[PDB]
């Protein structure tokens, strides 16, 4: 089910990430640094517990979750959110809720690349990751 997503992924394309960060209220200096950072995303499973690590020179995050079970999360920009990750149409869909707001982080595989679509408000960011060996 989620096997094709597992492994180590490196950022290779980013569109509209500044728009997404600005929609979330991220300050200009953080958005500068973030716009030049190329994170590595590691997705691992152990039974039905997934762990998703995002590593960079600026900030690191890690979450663990079961699909379809809500979890508390503190995001890279310090939002305290209620999260759930599920498979939907073969896509790994992560929904975050806080203060009545929502954002979605949708991952899909296209030609072996991992496409992450981030939506908040009207802002839609598309980031592309390539698999590391
Ligand atoms: C954690 C390292 C990943 C990306 C950029 C570097 C530092 C992050 C700090 C601030 C960014 C601010 C807001 C972004 C909001 C949510 C984080 C979601 C996705 C990170 C981007 C990704 O996984 O490619």
UniProtKB/Swiss-Prot annotation:
It is found in: Cytoplasm. Keywords: Acetylation, Cytoplasm, Lipid-binding, Phosphoprotein, Transport. GO terms for molecular function: cytoskeletal protein binding; icosatetraenoic acid binding; long-chain fatty acid binding; long-chain fatty acid transmembrane transporter activity; oleic acid binding. It comes from the Eukaryota. This is Fatty acid-binding protein, heart. Pfam families: Lipocalin (PF00061). The modification N-acetylvaline is found at residue 2. The lineage of its organism: Eukaryota, Metazoa, Chordata, Craniata, Vertebrata.
């Amino acid at each position: 089910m989620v096997d094709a997503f597992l492994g180590t992924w490196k950022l290779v394309d980013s569109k509209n990430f500044d728009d997404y960060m600005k929609s979330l209220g991220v300050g200009f200096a953080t958005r500068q640094v973030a716009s030049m950072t190329k994170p590595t995303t590691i997705i691992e499973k152990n039974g039905d517990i997934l762990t998703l690590k995002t590593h960079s020179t600026f900030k690191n995050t890690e979450i663990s979750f079961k699909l379809g079970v809500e979890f508390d999360e503190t995001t890279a920009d310090d939002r305290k959110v209620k999260s759930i990750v599920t498979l939907d149409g073969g896509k790994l869909v992560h929904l975050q809720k806080w203060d009545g707001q929502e954002t979605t982080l949708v991952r899909e595989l296209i030609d072996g690349k991992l496409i992450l679509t981030l939506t908040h408000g009207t802002a839609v960011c598309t980031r592309t990751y390539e698999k590391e060996a």
